[PDB]
């Protein structure tokens, strides 16, 4: 009803929603065979989980001269999320991290 | 100001022309003036400013003004002054013999002796614990520039693996300090030193973080358990980076040793058998050590060792008689321990770096250096004509009359094993005929011939006709016949400073009572507390 | 705030499980997307902590750690790459 | 003070002697004979028997410059400048037509002034130090001759610093106890009678210090050696220079010391011993250079043990035999050096005995051996016979008194037996005698010997008065050759007959007890405890040799192990305040024991770094959980800079760690855990123990009255201890430096050589076109880290982040740059750093020392415009920026790649 | 007591890491001993008090005393200066960060021409005769 | 228009937590059923930005990834490398990746 009660019950779900998200994403770093097939779960998770928990954090105690850095923080966790394993995907591939065996097409060398 | 807000100028005059000389580096001559301009106004303020706490008195300045307590106070008190007029002179003598070396022409040698002695009058004159330890980071991190600054503008694996042995065990040691001194504003409320006045004597809790406290200082200063790292590092360093350290860096640690165990142990009396017990066996194994050496530069380490266990007995015999013996051994070997690594560092630089018996007859072919060596290391044998004598004799003095025959017993037949090893470098090095040896004065891996580095760059070059500090003849080995290689500016320094260590001998009264003045500021700290805290 | 401390524990079974990841990782390159996962795990703890201890000096840390975050991870690639670009 | 006014002309005439020796080639020895002696003519008739000058000279130690001539020391200054003045006439006809003489009469003069100090020495402190100065200069004349006496010299100092420390040990005891430092007073203290085991221990204290300077039983082997210095250098040495300063010391001494049955015991036995083992290894050594050593040996040995007897009867025969002995040795190394330059040779291939060249130089030889023999009208044979008297009674009962008399005569049978091997026998043209202005100075001691065994009436009056005040009774001495049969003559009788007779079967004696004997002599017992010394030293030299850092700590460990087993019984902890343990606190703690165990058990130094980057993380954490928001702010940022670092150094190392054996990290771990707990264990028991420190307080309730800012972190960092700050920027700057300095001393290790297994024509290579990602991203991370650095600095005194997190927030900006480069040549910072970080630490001094305008040294000077609080705290910090700026862009140009691009 | 238990996990972490060969990882073992350093600074301000000293009037006895985080702020500073000068040490000794090296002494000598500058009259102190 | 920012960031929040729901279904399928293929894409993206950012989305989709870029062409035609998790056909991935394009081309645009 009121217009602190649905902020709060937002930020609780949303922080919810970001752990369970980063429960994911670390069960993925488990129980998956490639290191690109790890980044390609990470460069998501790790994105979508923080700004999940950063916004309801935010929503949590919503004080006013923290906006603009969330605003911010949120679209600077999103490209360094998509960068770093963008980069990290790359940097093993260079340094020869092996695909897995379950690979059925592949249009770059690997030798 | 109020002539006690000048006090901080010991640390803000160099802490400025340091951060100027790092500007403008490349005019040598202009920062070669600049830095002997400063250290010779320091040695003039605490030589002035020894004459303000000659009656006891205890000059403290409130750093920014705030409540006692609450800021860092500087303090002065006839102990800390002795320490900065001796490091000081001490720091003069070494960068004079650093110009004539062939050190001082390269990169940022005028700003870290000018940090480095910043570092060392904060360390001195700092009241409280924490700005200390802060001080203590002040004066190692520019040590560790110089010791890579060498004659010839190059680093080998040897003196990179002595800094990091250096380095590594003095970030341990700092670290130990560090976590003392936070276990003791854990127990206590304060780290000012003045505010600790009794908080030893009173609970154990605290007791055994100024322990640790005075074994990280005990680190610093290489005492017998941990003493191998100072033998293993000074060796290895440039002859005039090892005399400038001979004097600054275990001394301040033996300064911070006597300042709080005489303020915060208030000199227990119940803690003193240890001190006796580590100091005697330092006083011993040091100079066994020395004795079991074969390089003259590597023999000297191990002596400094000794004689550091020689200073520290001075505060477990605390007492009227037992500071005093002790601050008057630390002043005078310091200034004696300069002296000798400046003596045989002078051979190092012309002769170059070998071992005992490679050279020979060095008495007869360069008589300058062979007088300053002869006669600071009759003074640190303690030998009569000459000040360690009468160092040697107050701390027999003391130490019987406190009962230590043990501990007296090591400190008299201890000069025996020192006079055997400065006999052994007498005879290896200046004893003999004058034999025609090789005009080879930089190991290789010193050399700026078989290094791929590109070299310290030098002051002197921008002339052309230098390449790294050598005359190169310009452009348009063979046994060198015995001769004198060491001119009057390279024995300069260590022959001035060993008619210090003769002047304090024959006039040692003059010394004498300057001790004691400041040995009554610690075994009765009541007017240093009492100028702290109000 | 007992969505917070669920939620703090859930983020640190994630860390610890990502860690264990970091550790047994057969290619060197795993133990960098670990240490990428498990950097954004602890700015979402930062957050969620400065949440739990009520504290207006958060975000700060949040603007800084993912500059952080990045830095330290784009490095470790660089380090993957045997320094090579 | 005329007494010292005497002692400072001895001494003004050594300071003088080089200047003579210089201007006179070698007649320079005929003045300071002149003013050697006359000083000694001086001192025994311009002053006193007995006065007592004393200038102040150390009243802090209560040491004074006091200088006494009680008749002992009036027989001895006599005794030792006499000599000294005739060795100076003989030796400027002994020394060669040279002109560089200096180096021997500075310290031929300057021996006779320490000896004039010894004997003059009312102060047991002053008297080491002229002991110490004798020593020295003993050294220093051995040194001479060359290589010959480098070894014998440095023996000789040891062995008499041996000695003459335990002298410093003695007199230490004796200033400690008696509380004062007179030997006027010391030896007449009511002590010696109280407690004899104080007595015991200064008298043997005080025995080997005279045994050492003396050459005693275990000492003697640096006497015979000596011998390498010239002969006249000898014969003050022998005579009265060195060897009669022990025996100066035992005669003072003995007014206190001479009741006690270890003094008398120790110096009777032991002078005995080594007077018969010198008189036999004089009778059987050859060259008169060995001999003569050998015998002043025995001498010195008689005349300790008839000291050692400790009588008034023996203080006078122990006077008379030292004057006797300075006396006929100082002529017999005299003759033995003129009959050495005379001919050339004192043993090439031998020499025919003495009596060849009779006239002149055979007659004082046959005057100084027969005195040194003891026949009948000499110095040397009423002397003699008054030592006989005196040993007659020494103490120990009614037996052992008796023996000592018969040893005495065995001692004094080989004495003469060796004398008579002197003056004749092979010690394996020359018309040109002796200058009368050589031999003479030689024949004076010789006929001095004769005139005062003749005429010995001259003597009493003086060495009697010299005995009375050596101990403290007095005896009626008369030197007269009476021919009253006394037990004191009957054994001289039977030396000079069993002399003889042993003098006639010579040979097979000799060849008798040379097999038989075994070394108790020779040089190789001082060397073999030198060896074992520099043997032990090498030992416990071996402990710390290897200079590895893994070894120098365990050092630091053990010490570390034994102050934590001191500690846990040690502390006994207050109860506790509050709970400094929270809900949100066993998570990070979790997050931080894993990250430890994953980076202390890593075997690649990637996984490494990045668990030290998670370290990093969880330590921010942990800081920002205890409410520290500044500190966990800059520890996220230097986890950033030092990971950034450890990436840039281990581009250059290889991808594992060095495998280090078993049963070595067992025991590392074993220690670790150990000091683990020890630190965990003071951390619990020393911390939540207390309210709030007193300045904490302050700093919370003073901080925006004080400084205007609320951020009590940075008002504590720039405002009250502003001098931590100052010293940790310019620490900073130096690391800066100094880093600068190690990268241009040696070659940093070139990036290693990855070998990329990817073909060339594949994308996910080509750098330039493939950082693409970075250089579109830095586009909006450059702008934003600046405005972020720039919005720290400015509040960072009402807010978290003064000027160290707005430094390292632009240190990660530059290691953006670093990144984003396509290669290694645009990499490179192109901005002066070295210039940045000068400009930031004169910065931060100057604000700091701007404070003196109102105030002291770093102190703000807020003034306020509007309503703005502006302060110098904001100068200081943009300093602090601009150091720490120009370090991370040093550490980043510098380690950055390799890029060899800035030299011609 | 946990910021007593994570001080002694990275002080046992820093015992064993400095014990270990590679001088890498013993600048690990000395940043992690740092951060112990820092860890019981921290603690010595009490610790039972979890606020931040930002607020208008802070609260004692409820808020994080001030000086062992200045204290902390400022090591940090120093021990990352010391680390990062000890990283640039690592990579200019040897070919490697190899740290197993014994004594060294003889590679800062000259060659030492045998026997001396006198073969003829050896010392007869030196057990090597 | 005070709360337009409100209603659009809480339609973003709802485009993400079905991509986040869609991210948790990742994490649990059973093995055998993710088929990673690499791609080579043809980008249609002149400028740095356009490409990076399509990179950028690509990666945070959450069943692809974009490994590097380069353009073997004279100046222009961007190509991506692109890493894609249960697209079992190559067709199939860069028919999604030309969707994905599309719909981000149509918007950061004239
Ligand atoms: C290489 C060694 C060189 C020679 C070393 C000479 C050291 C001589 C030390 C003499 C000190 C006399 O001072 C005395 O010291 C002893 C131990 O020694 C202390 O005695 C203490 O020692 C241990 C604890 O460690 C306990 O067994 C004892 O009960 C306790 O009192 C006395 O409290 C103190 O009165
Ligand atoms: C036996 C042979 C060796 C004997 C060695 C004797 C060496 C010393 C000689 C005695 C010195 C004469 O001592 C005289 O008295 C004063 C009173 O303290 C000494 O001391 C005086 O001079 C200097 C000042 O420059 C300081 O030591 C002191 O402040 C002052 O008291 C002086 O040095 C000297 O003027
Ligand atoms: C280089 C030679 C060194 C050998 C030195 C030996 C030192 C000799 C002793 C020096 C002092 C002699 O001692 C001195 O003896 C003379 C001479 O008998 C005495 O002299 C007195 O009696 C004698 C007669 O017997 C007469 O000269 C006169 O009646 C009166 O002067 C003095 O009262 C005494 O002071
Ligand atoms: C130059 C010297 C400087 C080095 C100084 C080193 C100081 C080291 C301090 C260690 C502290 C010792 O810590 C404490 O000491 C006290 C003093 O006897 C002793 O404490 C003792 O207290 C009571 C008596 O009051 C005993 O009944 C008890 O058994 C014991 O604990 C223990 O030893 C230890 O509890
Ligand atoms: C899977 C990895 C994560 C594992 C998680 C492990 C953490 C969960 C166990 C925590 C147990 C509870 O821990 C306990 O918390 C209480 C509050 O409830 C703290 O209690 C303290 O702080 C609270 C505030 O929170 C105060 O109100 C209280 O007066 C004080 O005592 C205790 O000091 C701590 O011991």
Not at chain 5, 13 to 33: C, E
């Amino acid at each position: 009803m009121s217009w602190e009660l649905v902020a709060t019950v937002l930020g609780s779900v949303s922080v919810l929603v970001g752990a369970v998200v980063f429960l994911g994403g670390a069960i993925g770093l488990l129980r998956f065979p490639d290191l690109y097939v790890r980044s390609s779960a990470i460069g998501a998770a790790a994105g979508l989980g923080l700004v999940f928990v950063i916004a309801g954090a935010f929503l949590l105690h919503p004080t006013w001269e923290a906006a603009p850095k969330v605003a911010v923080a949120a679209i600077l966790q999103f490209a360094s999320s998509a960068i770093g394993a963008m980069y990290i995907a790359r940097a093993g591939f260079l340094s020869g991290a092996a695909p897995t065996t379950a690979t059925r097409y592949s249009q770059i060398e690997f030798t | 100001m109020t002539l006690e807000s000048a006090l901080t100028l010991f640390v803000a005059v160099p802490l400025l022309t340091a951060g100027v000389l790092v500007a403008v580096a490349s005019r040598t001559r202009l920062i070669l003036t600049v830095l002997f301009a400063v250290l010779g106004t320091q040695l003039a303020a605490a030589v002035a400013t020894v004459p303000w706490v000659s009656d006891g008195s205890v000059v403290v300045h409130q750093v920014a003004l705030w409540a006692p307590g609450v800021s860092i106070p500087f303090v002065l008190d006839m102990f800390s002054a002795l320490m900065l007029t001796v490091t000081s002179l001490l720091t003069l003598t070494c960068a004079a013999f650093a110009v004539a070396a062939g050190e001082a022409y390269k990169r940022f040698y005028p700003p870290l002796v000018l940090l480095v002695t910043a570092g060392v009058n904060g360390a001195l004159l700092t009241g409280d614990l924490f700005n200390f330890f802060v001080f203590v980071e002040v004066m190692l991190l520019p040590s560790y520039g110089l010791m890579m600054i060498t004659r010839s503008g190059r680093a080998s694996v040897v003196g990179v693996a002595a800094s990091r042995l250096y380095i590594s065990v003095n970030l341990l040691a700092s670290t130990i300090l560090l976590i003392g001194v936070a276990l003791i504003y854990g127990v206590t409320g304060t780290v000012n030193i003045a505010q600790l006045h009794g908080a030893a004597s009173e609970d154990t809790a605290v007791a055994v973080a100024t322990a640790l406290v005075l074994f990280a200082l005990a680190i610093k200063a290489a005492v017998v358990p941990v003493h191998g790292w100072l033998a293993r590092a000074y060796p290895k360093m440039s002859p005039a980076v090892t005399a400038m350290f001979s004097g600054l860096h275990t001394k301040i640690a033996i300064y911070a040793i006597y300042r709080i165990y005489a303020v915060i142990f208030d000199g227990d009396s119940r803690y003193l058998w240890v001190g006796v017990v580590v100091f005697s066996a330092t006083m011993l194994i040091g100079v066994l050590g020395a004795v079991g050496e074969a390089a003259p530069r590597s023999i000297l380490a191990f002596h400094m060792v000794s004689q550091i266990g020689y200073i520290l007995l001075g505060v477990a015999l605390f007492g009227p008689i037992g500071l005093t013996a002790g601050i008057f051994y630390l002043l005078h070997h310091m200034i004696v321990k300069a002296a000798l690594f400046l003596a045989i560092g002078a051979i190092e630089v012309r002769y170059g770096p070998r071992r005992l018996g490679q050279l020979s007859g060095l008495a007869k072919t360069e008589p300058l250096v062979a007088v300053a060596f002869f006669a600071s290391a009759m003074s640190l044998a303690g030998i009569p004509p000459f000040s360690g004598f009468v160092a040697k004799l107050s701390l027999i003095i003391a130490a019987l009359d406190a009962g230590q025959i043990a501990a007296a017993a090591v400190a008299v037949v201890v000069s025996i094993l020192t006079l055997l090893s400065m006999l052994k470098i007498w005879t290896g090095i200046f004893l003999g005929e004058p034999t025609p040896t090789d005009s080879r004065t930089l190991p290789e891996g010193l050399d700026p011939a078989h290094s791929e580095a590109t070299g310290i760059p030098d002051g002197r070059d921008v002339d052309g006709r230098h390449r790294d500090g050598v005359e190169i003849t310009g452009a348009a080995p063979d046994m060198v016949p015995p001769g004198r290689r060491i001119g009057l500016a390279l024995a300069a320094p260590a022959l001035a400073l060993s008619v210090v260590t003769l002047a304090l001998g024959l006039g040692g009264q003059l010394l004498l009572e300057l001790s004691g003045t400041a040995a009554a500021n610690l075994y009765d700290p009541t007017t240093y507390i009492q100028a702290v805290l109000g | 705030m007992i969505v917070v401390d669920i939620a703090i524990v859930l983020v640190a079974i994630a860390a610890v499980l990502s860690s264990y990841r970091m550790i047994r990782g057969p290619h060197a390159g795993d133990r960098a997307i670990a240490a990428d996962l498990l950097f954004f795990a602890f700015i979402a703890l930062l957050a969620l902590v400065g949440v739990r201890v009520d504290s207006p000096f958060v975000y700060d840390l949040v603007l800084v750690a993912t500059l952080v975050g990045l830095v330290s991870a784009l490095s470790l690639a660089r380090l993957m790459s045997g320094g090579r670009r | 003070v005329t007494l010292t006014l005497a002692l400072a002309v001895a001494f003004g005439i050594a300071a003088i002697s080089p200047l003579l020796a210089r201007t006179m080639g070698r007649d320079a020895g005929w003045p300071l004979a002149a003013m050697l002696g006359g000083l000694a003519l001086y001192i025994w008739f311009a002053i006193p028997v007995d006065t007592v000058a004393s200038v102040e000279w150390m009243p802090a130690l209560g040491v004074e410059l006091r200088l006494s001539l009680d008749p002992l020391a009036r027989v001895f200054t006599m005794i030792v400048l006499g000599i000294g003045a005739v060795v100076m006439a003989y030796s400027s006809r002994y020394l060669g037509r040279g002109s560089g003489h200096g180096g021997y009469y500075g310290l031929m003069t300057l021996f006779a002034a320490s000896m004039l100090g010894l004997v003059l020495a009312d102060d047991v402190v002053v008297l080491f130090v002229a002991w110490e100065f004798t020593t020295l200069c003993s050294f220093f004349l051995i040194t001479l001759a060359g290589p010959k006496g480098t070894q014998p010299a440095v023996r000789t100092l040891l062995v008499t610093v041996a000695g003459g420390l335990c002298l410093l040990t003695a007199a230490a005891l004796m200033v400690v106890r008696t509380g004062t430092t007179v030997l006027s007073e010391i030896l007449v203290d009511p002590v010696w009678s109280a407690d004899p085991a104080f007595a015991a221990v200064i008298a043997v204290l005080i025995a080997m210090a005279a045994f050492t300077k003396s050459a005693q039983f275990p000492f003697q082997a640096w006497l015979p050696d000596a011998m390498v210095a010239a002969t006249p250098v000898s014969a003050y040495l022998h005579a009265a220079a060195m060897v009669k300063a022990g025996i100066y010391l035992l005669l003072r001494f003995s007014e206190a010391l001479h009741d006690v049955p270890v003094w008398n015991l120790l110096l009777i036995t032991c002078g005995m011993t080594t007077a018969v083992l010198g008189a036999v290894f004089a009778m059987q050594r050859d060259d008169l250079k060995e001999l003569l050593a050998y015998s002043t040996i025995s001498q010195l040995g008689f005349l300790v043990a008839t000291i050692g007897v400790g009588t008034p009867a023996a203080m006078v025969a122990a006077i008379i035999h030292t004057i006797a002995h300075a006396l006929f040795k100082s002529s017999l190394f005299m003759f033995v050096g003129v009959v050495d330059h005379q001919t050339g040779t004192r043993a090439m291939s031998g020499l025919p005995r003495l009596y060849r060249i009779m006239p002149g130089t055979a007659i004082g030889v046959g005057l100084a051996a027969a005195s040194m023999a003891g026949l009948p009208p000499l110095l040397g044979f009423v002397s003699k016979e008054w030592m006989f008297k005196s040993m007659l009674d020494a103490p120990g009962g009614a037996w052992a008194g008796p023996a000592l008399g018969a040893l005495a005569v065995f001692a004094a049978t080989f004495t003469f037996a060796y004398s008579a091997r002197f003056l004749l026998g092979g010690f394996v043209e020359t018309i040109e005698a002796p200058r009368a202005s050589f031999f003479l100075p030689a024949a004076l001691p010789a006929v001095l010997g004769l005139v005062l065994g003749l005429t010995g009436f001259l003597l009493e009056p003086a060495v009697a008065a010299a005995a009375r005040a050596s101990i403290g009774e007095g005896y009626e001495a008369d030197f007269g050759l009476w021919h009253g049969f006394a037990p004191e003559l009957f054994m001289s009788m039977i030396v000079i007959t069993l002399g003889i007779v042993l003098v006639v079967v010579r040979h097979p004696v000799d060849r008798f007890l040379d097999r038989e004997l075994a070394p108790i002599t020779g040089v190789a017992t001082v060397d073999a405890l030198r060896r074992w010394a520099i043997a032990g030293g090498a030992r416990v030299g071996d402990v710390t040799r290897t200079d590895r850092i893994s070894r120098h700590v365990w050092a630091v460990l053990l010490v570390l192990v034994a102050l934590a087993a001191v500690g846990v019984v040690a502390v006994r902890p207050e109860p506790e305040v509050g709970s400094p343990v929270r809900a949100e606190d066993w998570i990070v703690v979790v997050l931080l024991v894993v990250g430890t165990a994953a980076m202390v058990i890593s075997r690649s130094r990637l996984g490494a770094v990045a668990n030290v980057g998670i370290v990093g993380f969880a330590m921010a954490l942990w800081f920002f959980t205890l409410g520290a928001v500044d500190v966990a702010l800059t520890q996220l940022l230097v986890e950033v800079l030092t990971v950034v670092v450890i990436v840039l150094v281990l581009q250059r190392l290889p991808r594992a760690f060095h495998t280090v054996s078993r049963s070595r990290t067992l025991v590392s771990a074993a220690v670790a855990i150990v000091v683990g707990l020890a630190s965990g264990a003071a951390v619990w028991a020393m911390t939540g123990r207390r309210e709030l420190s007193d300045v904490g307080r302050y700093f919370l309730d003073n901080a925006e009255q004080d400084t205007g800012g609320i951020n009590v972190v940075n008002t504590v960092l720039v405002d009250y201890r502003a001098l931590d700050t100052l010293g940790e920027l310019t620490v900073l700057g130096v690391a800066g430096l100094a880093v600068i300095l190690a990268l241009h001393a040696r070659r940093a290790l070139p990036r290693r050589d990855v070998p990329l297994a990817v073909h060339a024509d594949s994308p996910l290579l080509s750098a330039q076109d493939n950082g693409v990602f970075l250089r579109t991203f830095a586009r909006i991370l450059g702008p934003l880290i600046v405005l972020l650095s720039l919005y720290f600095l400015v509040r960072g005194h009402n807010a978290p982040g003064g000027g160290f997190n707005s430094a390292l927030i632009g240190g990660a900006g530059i290691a953006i740059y670093y990144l984003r480069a396509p290669s290694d040549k645009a990499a490179r910072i192109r901005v002066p750093y070295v210039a940045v970080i000068a400009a930031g630490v004169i910065i931060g001094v100057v604000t700091g020392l701007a404070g003196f305008v109102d105030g002291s040294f770093l102190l703000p000077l807020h003034a306020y415009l509007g309503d703005v609080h502006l302060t110098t705290a904001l100068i200081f910090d943009v300093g602090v920026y601009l150091a720490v700026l120009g370090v991370i862009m040093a550490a980043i140009d510098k380690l950055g790649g390799d890029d060899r691009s800035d030299e011609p | 007591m946990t910021l007593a238990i994570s001080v002694g996990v990275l002080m046992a972490g820093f015992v064993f890491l400095v014990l270990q060969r590679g001088m890498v990882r013993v600048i690990l073992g000395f940043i992690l001993l740092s951060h112990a350093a820092h860890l019981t600074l921290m603690a010595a301000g009490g610790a039972s008090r979890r606020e931040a000293p930002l607020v208008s009037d802070p609260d004692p006895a409820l808020t994080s005393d001030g000086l062992p985080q200045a204290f902390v702020l400022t090591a940090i500073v120093i021990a990352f200066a010391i680390t990062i000068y000890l990283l640039v040490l690592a990579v200019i000794g040897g070919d490697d960060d190899d740290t197993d090296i014994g004594d060294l002494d003889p590679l800062d000598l000259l060659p030492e021409t045998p026997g001396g500058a006198h073969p003829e009259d050896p010392e007869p102190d030196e057990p090597s005769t | 228009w005070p709360l337009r920012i409100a209603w659009f960031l809480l339609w973003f929040f709802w485009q993400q937590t079905t991509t986040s729901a869609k991210v948790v279904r990742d994490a649990f399928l059973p093995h055998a059923s993710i088929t990673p293929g690499f791609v080579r894409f043809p980008t249609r993206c002149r400028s740095e930005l356009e490409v990076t950012m399509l990179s950028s989305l690509i990666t945070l989709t959450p069943g692809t990834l974009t490994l590097g870029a380069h353009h073997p062409g004279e100046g222009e035609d961007w190509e991506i490398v692109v890493h894609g998790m249960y697209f079992p056909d190559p067709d199939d991935l860069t028919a999604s990746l030309h969707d994905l394009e599309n719909h981000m081309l149509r918007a950061i645009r004239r």
